[PDB]
Amino acid sequence: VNFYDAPNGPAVEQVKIEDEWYNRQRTEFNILNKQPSKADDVFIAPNAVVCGDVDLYQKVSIFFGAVVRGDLNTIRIGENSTILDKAVVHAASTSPTGLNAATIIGSNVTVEPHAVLRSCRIGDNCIVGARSVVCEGAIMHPESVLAPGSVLAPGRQIPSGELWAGSPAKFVRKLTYYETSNVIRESAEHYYDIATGFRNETFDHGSAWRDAEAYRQKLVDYKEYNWVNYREQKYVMRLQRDAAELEKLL
Amino acid sequence: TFNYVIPYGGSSSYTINNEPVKAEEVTVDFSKEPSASSLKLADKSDWIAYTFNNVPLMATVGLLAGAHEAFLHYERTPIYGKRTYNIIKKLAPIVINKTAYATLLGAIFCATDALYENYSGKKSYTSGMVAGAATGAVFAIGRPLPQPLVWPLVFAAAPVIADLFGEVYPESMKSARGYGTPYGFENLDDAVPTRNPIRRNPHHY
Amino acid sequence: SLLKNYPPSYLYPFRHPKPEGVIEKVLFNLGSLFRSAGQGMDELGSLMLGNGGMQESVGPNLAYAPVKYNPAAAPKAGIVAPIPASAQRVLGVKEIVLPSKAESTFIAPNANVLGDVKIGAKSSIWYGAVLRGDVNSIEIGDNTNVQDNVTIHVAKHSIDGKLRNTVIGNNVTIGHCATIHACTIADNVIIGMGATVLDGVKVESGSIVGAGSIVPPNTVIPAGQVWVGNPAKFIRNVLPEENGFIASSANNYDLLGQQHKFENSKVFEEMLVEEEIAKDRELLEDKNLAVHQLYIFDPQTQLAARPR
Amino acid sequence: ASFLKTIVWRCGFAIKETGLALETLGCKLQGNYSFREKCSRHTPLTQYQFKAPSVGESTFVAPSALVSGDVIIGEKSSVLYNAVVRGEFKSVTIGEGSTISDNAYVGSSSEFSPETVIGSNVSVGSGAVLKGCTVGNNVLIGNNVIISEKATVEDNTILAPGSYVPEDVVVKSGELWSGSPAQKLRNLDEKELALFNTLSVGATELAADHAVIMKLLELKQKEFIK
Amino acid sequence: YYLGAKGHTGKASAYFTSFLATKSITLYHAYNSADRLMGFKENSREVVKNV
Amino acid sequence: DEPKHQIPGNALDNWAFLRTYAKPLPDMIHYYYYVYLFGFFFVYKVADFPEYSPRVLVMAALIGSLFYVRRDWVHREFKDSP
Amino acid sequence: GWEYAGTYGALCGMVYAIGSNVISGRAWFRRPWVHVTSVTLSYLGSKLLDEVQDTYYLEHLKRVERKGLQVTEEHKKLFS
Numbered sequence A: 001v002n003f004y005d006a007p008n009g010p011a012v013e014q015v016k017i018e019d020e021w022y023n024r025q026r027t028e029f030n031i032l033n034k035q036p037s038k039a040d041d042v043f044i045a046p047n048a049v050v051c052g053d054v055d056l057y058q059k060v061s062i063f064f065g066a067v068v069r070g071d072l073n074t075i076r077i078g079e080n081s082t083i084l085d086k087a088v089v090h091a092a093s094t095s096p097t098g099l100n101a102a103t104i105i106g107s108n109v110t111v112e113p114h115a116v117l118r119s120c121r122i123g124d125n126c127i128v129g130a131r132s133v134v135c136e137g138a139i140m141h142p143e144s145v146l147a148p149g150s151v152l153a154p155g156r157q158i159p160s161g162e163l164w165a166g167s168p169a170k171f172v173r174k175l176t177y178y179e180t181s182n183v184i185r186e187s188a189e190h191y192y193d194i195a196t197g198f199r200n201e202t203f204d205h206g207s208a209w210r211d212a213e214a215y216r217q218k219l220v221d222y223k224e225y226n227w228v229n230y231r232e233q234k235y236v237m238r239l240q241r242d243a244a245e246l247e248k249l250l
Numbered sequence B: 001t002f003n004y005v006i007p008y009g010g011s012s013s014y015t016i017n018n019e020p021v022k023a024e025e026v027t028v029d030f031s032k033e034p035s036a037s038s039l040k041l042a043d044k045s046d047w048i049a050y051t052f053n054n055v056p057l058m059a060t061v062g063l064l065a066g067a068h069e070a071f072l073h074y075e076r077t078p079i080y081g082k083r084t085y086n087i088i089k090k091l092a093p094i095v096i097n098k099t100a101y102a103t104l105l106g107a108i109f110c111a112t113d114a115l116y117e118n119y120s121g122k123k124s125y126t127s128g129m130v131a132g133a134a135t136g137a138v139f140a141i142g143r144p145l146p147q148p149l150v151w152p153l154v155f156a157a158a159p160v161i162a163d164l165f166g167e168v169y170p171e172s173m174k175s176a177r178g179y180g181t182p183y184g185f186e187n188l189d190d191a192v193p194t195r196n197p198i199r200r201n202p203h204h205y
Numbered sequence C: 001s002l003l004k005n006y007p008p009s010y011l012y013p014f015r016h017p018k019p020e021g022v023i024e025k026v027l028f029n030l031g032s033l034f035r036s037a038g039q040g041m042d043e044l045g046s047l048m049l050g051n052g053g054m055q056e057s058v059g060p061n062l063a064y065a066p067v068k069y070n071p072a073a074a075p076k077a078g079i080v081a082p083i084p085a086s087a088q089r090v091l092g093v094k095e096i097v098l099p100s101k102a103e104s105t106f107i108a109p110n111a112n113v114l115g116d117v118k119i120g121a122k123s124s125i126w127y128g129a130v131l132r133g134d135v136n137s138i139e140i141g142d143n144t145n146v147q148d149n150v151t152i153h154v155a156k157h158s159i160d161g162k163l164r165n166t167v168i169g170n171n172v173t174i175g176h177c178a179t180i181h182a183c184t185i186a187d188n189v190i191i192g193m194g195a196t197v198l199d200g201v202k203v204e205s206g207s208i209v210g211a212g213s214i215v216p217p218n219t220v221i222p223a224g225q226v227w228v229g230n231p232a233k234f235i236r237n238v239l240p241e242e243n244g245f246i247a248s249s250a251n252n253y254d255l256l257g258q259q260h261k262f263e264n265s266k267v268f269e270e271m272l273v274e275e276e277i278a279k280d281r282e283l284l285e286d287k288n289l290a291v292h293q294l295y296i297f298d299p300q301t302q303l304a305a306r307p308r
Numbered sequence D: 001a002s003f004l005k006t007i008v009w010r011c012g013f014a015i016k017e018t019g020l021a022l023e024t025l026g027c028k029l030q031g032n033y034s035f036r037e038k039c040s041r042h043t044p045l046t047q048y049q050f051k052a053p054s055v056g057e058s059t060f061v062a063p064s065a066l067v068s069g070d071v072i073i074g075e076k077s078s079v080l081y082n083a084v085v086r087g088e089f090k091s092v093t094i095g096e097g098s099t100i101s102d103n104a105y106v107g108s109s110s111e112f113s114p115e116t117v118i119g120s121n122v123s124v125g126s127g128a129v130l131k132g133c134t135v136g137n138n139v140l141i142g143n144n145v146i147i148s149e150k151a152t153v154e155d156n157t158i159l160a161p162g163s164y165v166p167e168d169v170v171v172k173s174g175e176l177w178s179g180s181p182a183q184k185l186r187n188l189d190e191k192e193l194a195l196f197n198t199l200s201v202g203a204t205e206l207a208a209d210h211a212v213i214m215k216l217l218e219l220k221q222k223e224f225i226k
Numbered sequence E: 001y002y003l004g005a006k007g008h009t010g011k012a013s014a015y016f017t018s019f020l021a022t023k024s025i026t027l028y029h030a031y032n033s034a035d036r037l038m039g040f041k042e043n044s045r046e047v048v049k050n051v
Numbered sequence F: 001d002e003p004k005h006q007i008p009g010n011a012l013d014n015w016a017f018l019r020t021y022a023k024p025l026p027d028m029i030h031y032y033y034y035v036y037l038f039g040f041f042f043v044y045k046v047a048d049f050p051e052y053s054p055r056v057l058v059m060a061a062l063i064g065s066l067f068y069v070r071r072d073w074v075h076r077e078f079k080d081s082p
Numbered sequence G: 001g002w003e004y005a006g007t008y009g010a011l012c013g014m015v016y017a018i019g020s021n022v023i024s025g026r027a028w029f030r031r032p033w034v035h036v037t038s039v040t041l042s043y044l045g046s047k048l049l050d051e052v053q054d055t056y057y058l059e060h061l062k063r064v065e066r067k068g069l070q071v072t073e074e075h076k077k078l079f080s
């Protein structure tokens, strides 16, 4: 329930989901000791959720509904790589192959909507199609494309310059020089332009806080608002927990 | 001119001359004249005397180079370990040979320069080129194939650079002033100075 | 803590206490003027911006959200609750079905859990998961993980009497982006990421449904078998160690849900205070600062603990 | 022209930005820091510049759903929870009685995407990805169906769940298609042909119930705010 | 006040800065006036005002 | 596969040549101390040097540059031997 | 001195605002208040720099006239 060794301390007040009267979901938030890192030009949609040890490089775009959970292990998304709508990127604690279980995404990688990536190595200039599942330990080498509705089984490899399709994904054709050189990069650049557009009409603190401030001001006016020194309470709770842990016999 | 019809530039009459006019009414000089020691060292009349006056520079440079190398060796030798060999017996040949070979090269250079100037009877670029060529030839006696060509060329080129930028350059631009009126053009209406600017005193360090 | 003279702005960063000095009162009044002028300028800009004006509002909490109660079809999984009287004289609904969850359950704020949904203890509904029990009940057992962007759907039983409720057993893992319509899942089953389980499908205990596999309707996946494919077909039997993996995945996601529930459940004032804790942790990383000579600071909350 | 509209948008946006900054400065002077709250800034009907979602009176758009850009939704249509309808780059049209189900993406946001058109009585399954395609009247799309750009689905057709439609592939009328490369399985029998309108009207009834409940949620929020 | 509020001590920083700058500029003015009295600087107004 | 430059020498022989640079490294203060001291005294003595012809100065600079040994060269080739 | 100093200063204030937005990843139109502030301060600073240059030009003219440089009335007109 309460993690007393949490980096910022125990939680003085925890509120239940039933008691919430508005949506408080944060697009970037810290899971215990793991902190997501982002560049200046990284676009995270309001719907999107990014938590854990996720490192977002420059020109990374996280579109609406995408969930990038970096709780079990590290996720790295390379430069100008776009995670499109409702696409989940997650990392496993360990990989079946025995290699590193981090989810590393290279540069100019487009993950199409509803595609699931878990503990995979995605090389530079790659496209993962819509509803394509890349399982743990699967490695896509650079300049390779996975067609929509295809599954890369755990510990499998897609060679460079190749298009792969099917539920047991198989070789279809060799990607042409024009494709690998231009179009794969161009798709990521297009989605960067779209995300740049979305960033340009975003206010730093959009006027949704006013509604909650109205409730807080009403509580202040009726004298129910309470001022709590959370820092001191965290210190006191940790002290009490240590004393109790010393006292216990079993 | 800035047109395609008549030649650019201009011409000055050779018959017509313009009377010199002083850059300023009173001239104050902060540049000191050459010392008697400089004229003594520059004198190439007696080639032996000229050589012996100018070699201390070469011997000094060879001594610094040998000292640099000898210290690089000395720094490496371990004080904690007692050494069977004598360090100075190892290090003295370095410094002595560097100094001797530097002095020999400088001696060839100065002697050939003075001998050529005496025989030619004129001060010219060619004396420096020939002295440098001889010095570079002595540098590359037993050296592999590119070096018989490159060292005479480099050692000859060095006095050309020294003559071009040490003697010709200063003498070419003595007249140019930078204040008052341009040296060629005094007819133009520019502020005329009573006295030349003194930006610094004669140095004494 | 060691000191009690900390500035009130430092102790209450979320909201500074009522101004007491004259200068503070003047600053408060000037802030009021600035706030009103800024709102006026905001509305003037919104006029030029066109239809919508780029207005923003707080969103409803859909993790614990009701559905219309049917007098004919009584609730099966969720509880039924009355609604406020004023909403009664506006909307006219007498009662509304609400989801039923245990205290240990973690539901993400993003997730939409609606109506006839019963969720057991230590189960987790993750981000983007939509659980609609509007027409029929949804039951989820203990230590069951509905992962990100999973859609669980139900239908009406109809004349045949075919059961169109969704019953998910204990220790069941539903992979990310999987779609589960009115099917039955037994205990200790992994549903792969992207897998589609249609109507009438009974998946027996100990089985694994592969990633991106569509199991055809009215298909029984027997116990201890792995089924993959667009027309999902049997490939191999579950290895004895893979069973221990199934349990390990369930338990690992239980711990994960506890952590995520702990992070999300903090109130705003505590979150802002924790942001300041992280910030002055970063500022205090330099150990040659003058204040470090003065005191040793508590690690979790950078407050002076003891003098140095 | 378009340039005039761009200039008007930039001027209005600058004014609104400065107003919000001044309001934040006033809050800082007062000592209130509620503006620093990181809450869900998601809007169900977002606009990109002057392109805003046109919406019918009887339509139901879920609060968690995102209808973005210029998307024209006809009357008695429903975009359900966590459904993403993107029409910024190219517009998206949805006909009367059509339903977009939960966790479904319909968009025309690729560079070369055609304008997405969805006809009347078209139900998109939960999880289906539709990109730059034309869907005709009375079409049932499966749960997890992928339909690629420039692909055409003719009237009175059902796409089985999990089917992927390659581009420039026409799905003909009165047919059932399935498979990762979509191929015709069987001709639709008469009962399924009649089932389309019943499915659509049931979806509309369900949407009306959900709209009533959503209004209830809004009144509860209003009680706190005011 | 502006700089001190960033450190949660606005009032004290404001008073200290005011005192500091006022003292410095007052000493500068007094030095100028003393030079004017000594005759080093222009003093026509001073000689008229205090004969 | 691409056309590549031919590398003269064997891999292990070249690596052995490169490994002769891995020797005990003195700290640079020892050289710097002596250079600073003798340089200060040298600058004091230079003001008393006779004025030399520019040609001789340039030749002396050339000889010094040719005679200068890089510190790495002594490092690789140093032997603690007679 | 320069007769185009203020116009240059205003344009350079625009340069400051737009460059600061671009370096930080923001678009040129973001943070509008920075534009007005940058323009006004840059215009004032460019003007002030011009008067400072003119003043020290005149001080140099006075010094050289004291020293003995026979500057004419027209040359005195060159230095405003």
Ligand SMILES: CCCCCCCCCCCCCCCCCC(=O)OC[C@H](COP(=O)([O-])OCC(O)COP(=O)([O-])OC[C@@H](COC(=O)CCCCCCCCCCCCCCCCC)OC(=O)CCCCCCCCCCCCCCCCC)OC(=O)CCCCCCCCCCCCCCCCC
Pocket: B061, B064, B065, B067, B068, B071, B150, B154, F034, F035, F038, F039, F042, F057, F058, F060, F061, F062, F064, F065, F066, F068, F069, F070, F071, F072
């Ligand atoms: C007991 C103590 C031990 C020291 C004993 C002496 C103690 C000092 C006493 C007095 C010191 C004051 C005077 C000494 C010289 C001043 C230098 C100094 O003190 O700096 C601190 C220096 C250490 O500083 P550092 O930062 O640690 O080292 C930097 C280097 O990177 C170091 O790293 P690195 O060694 O690994 O790299 C060296 C690098 C560093 O680079 C340099 O050395 C720069 C030197 C360039 C010339 C310097 C300016 C010359 C102007 C001289 C002015 C007087 C004449 C005026 C007219 C001349 C017109 C030019 O150069 C090279 O790579 C090797 C080539 C060396 C010359 C390069 C030019 C070649 C031109 C020849 C062309 C022919 C080739 C043609 C064929 C080519 C085929 C393609 O200490 C010394 O080196 C002093 C050693 C004394 C030996 C000098 C021997 C001759 C001295 C007079 C001749 C002048 C020429 C200069 C030769 C090189 C001198 C470095």
Ligand SMILES: CCCCCCCCCCCCCCCCCC(=O)OC[C@H](COP(=O)([O-])OCC(O)COP(=O)([O-])OC[C@@H](COC(=O)CCCCCCCCCCCCCCCCC)OC(=O)CCCCCCCCCCCCCCCCC)OC(=O)CCCCCCCCCCCCCCCCC
Pocket: C041, D014, D015, D018, D021, D022, D025, D028, G008, G009, G010, G012, G013, G016, G031, G032, G033, G034, G035, G036, G037, G038, G040, G041, G042, G043, G044, G045, G046, G049
């Ligand atoms: C060229 C050749 C070279 C030769 C020599 C060159 C010379 C070298 C030197 C030259 C150097 C130039 C380059 C450096 C430029 C300086 C950097 C810079 O641009 O500012 C940096 C700095 C960076 O801001 P930041 O990026 O947001 O980061 C600070 C953080 O917020 C940090 O937050 P914080 O906690 O630190 O917050 C403190 C600060 C920072 O807070 C903020 O900055 C937030 C924004 C402030 C509130 C928004 C300002 C409201 C007015 C802005 C007007 C924009 C119009 C555009 C849209 C039109 C709307 C109808 O708050 C302040 O703004 C303090 C100033 C108090 C004034 C506040 C506004 C008073 C109400 C308006 C007064 C008059 C209204 C009349 C009309 C109003 C409507 C037009 O900008 C400011 O601090 C702005 C201060 C002044 C605000 C604008 C007020 C202008 C007056 C309204 C316009 C009336 C016409 C103007 C003429 C008449 C004047 C009265």
Ligand SMILES: CCCCCCCCCCCCCCCCCC(=O)OC[C@H](COP(=O)([O-])OCC(O)COP(=O)([O-])OC[C@@H](COC(=O)CCCCCCCCCCCCCCCCC)OC(=O)CCCCCCCCCCCCCCCCC)OC(=O)CCCCCCCCCCCCCCCCC
Pocket: G008, G010, G011, G012, G014, G015, G016, G018, G019, G020, G022, G023, G024
């Ligand atoms: C009043 C009503 C308003 C009317 C308007 C009137 C206003 C007057 C003018 C105001 C307009 C705003 C000025 C623009 C500010 C930002 C410019 C910028 O960021 O550059 C790139 C920026 C676009 O870059 P980006 O894609 O947005 O990403 C940039 C990221 O930050 C970093 O991206 P990255 O990390 O990938 O870097 C890759 C980089 C590759 O890496 C490099 O190549 C670096 C090379 C070093 C610099 C280049 C050296 C050569 C530059 C020559 C100058 C170009 C003009 C040539 C004419 C000859 C002039 C003598 O490639 C580039 O960045 C672009 C290459 C070409 C641009 C180089 C020119 C920039 C010069 C310096 C900019 C000014 C910054 C001021 C800072 C303000 C405070 C922070 O602007 C452009 O679209 C093209 C450059 C436009 C040049 C105009 C700037 C004036 C400089 C001329 C000097 C004359 C004196 C100034 C007088 C100005 C008039 C008063």
Ligand SMILES: CCCCCCCCCCCCCCCCCC(=O)O[C@@H](COC(=O)CCCCCCCCCCCCCCC)COP(=O)(O)OCC[N+](C)(C)C
Pocket: C009, C016, C017, C018, C019, C020, C023, C024, C025, C026, C027, C028, C030, D025, D028, D029, D030, D031, D032, E001, E002, E003, E005, E006, E008, E010
């Ligand atoms: C318009 C003229 C009158 C202006 C009224 C101010 C006169 C008061 C006397 C001067 C006091 C200092 C002036 C304020 C400047 C900066 C003060 C400041 O930093 O503002 C805030 C925080 O900093 C900011 O928000 C930045 C504000 C920047 C300046 C914006 C105001 C611009 C006009 C004020 C100065 C105009 C000239 C003042 C008179 C010459 C201070 O935070 P707190 O220390 O917590 O005090 C607030 C008290 N309480 C929370 C308890 C209610």
Ligand SMILES: CCCCCCCCCCCCCCCCCCCC(=O)O[C@H](COC(=O)CCCCCCCCCCCCCC)COP(=O)(O)OCCN
Pocket: B120, B122, B124, B125, B126, B127, B153, B154, B156, B157, B160, B164
């Ligand atoms: C940067 C210049 C360095 C020279 C580079 C040349 C190529 C380097 C090869 C090394 C060869 C040694 C240098 C010899 C160059 C001198 C040219 C030879 C011409 C020549 O012999 O005439 C002498 C005068 O020229 C002279 O000695 C003075 C001429 C100045 C040299 C040319 C200057 C421009 C060259 C720039 C080319 C491009 C720069 C890239 C390096 C004799 O004259 P005299 O008075 O003795 O009469 C004789 C009465 N006994």
